[PDB]
Amino acid sequence: IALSTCAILXKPLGNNGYLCAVAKECMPSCN
């Protein structure tokens, strides 16, 4: 769980898919 293709395979739908949009990966200054 969580390195690689996690937030990389976003392409969410009407019911989302996997762990998108997280963390320093998506945010420049996460917390």
From Swiss-Prot:
MF terms in GO: signaling receptor binding
Sites of (Z)-2,3-didehydrobutyrine modification: 5
Protein's name according to its UniProt entry: Lantibiotic lichenicidin VK21 A1
A Gene Ontology term for the protein's cellular component: extracellular space
Keywords, sorted A to Z: Antibiotic, Antimicrobial, Bacteriocin, Lantibiotic, Secreted, Thioether bond
Role description: Lanthionine-containing peptide antibiotic (lantibiotic) active on Gram-positive bacteria. The bactericidal activity of lantibiotics is based on depolarization of energized bacterial cytoplasmic membranes, initiated by the formation of aqueous transmembrane pores. When present individually, LchA1 exhibits activity towards B.subtilis L1 (IC(50)=9 uM), Rhodococcus sp. SS2 (IC(50)=9 uM), M.luteus B1314 (IC(50)=1.2 uM), B.megaterium VKM41 (IC(50)=1.8 uM), S.aureus 209p (IC(50)=3.1 uM), B.pumilus 2001, B.globigii I, B.amyloliquefaciens I, M.smegmatis 1171 and M.phlei 1291.
KW Cell division (keyword) present: no
Changes after translation: Maturation of lantibiotics involves the enzymatic conversion of Thr, and Ser into dehydrated AA and the formation of thioether bonds with cysteine. This is followed by membrane translocation and cleavage of the modified precursor.
Example GO BP: defense response to Gram-positive bacterium
Organism classification: Bacteria, Bacillati, Bacillota, Bacilli, Bacillales
Domain of life: Bacteria
Cross-link named Beta-methyllanthionine (Thr-Cys), sites: 2-6, 21-26, 23-30
Cross-link Lanthionine (Ser-Cys): residue positions: 10-20
Residues bearing PTM 2,3-didehydroalanine (Ser): 4
Locations listed in the record: Secreted
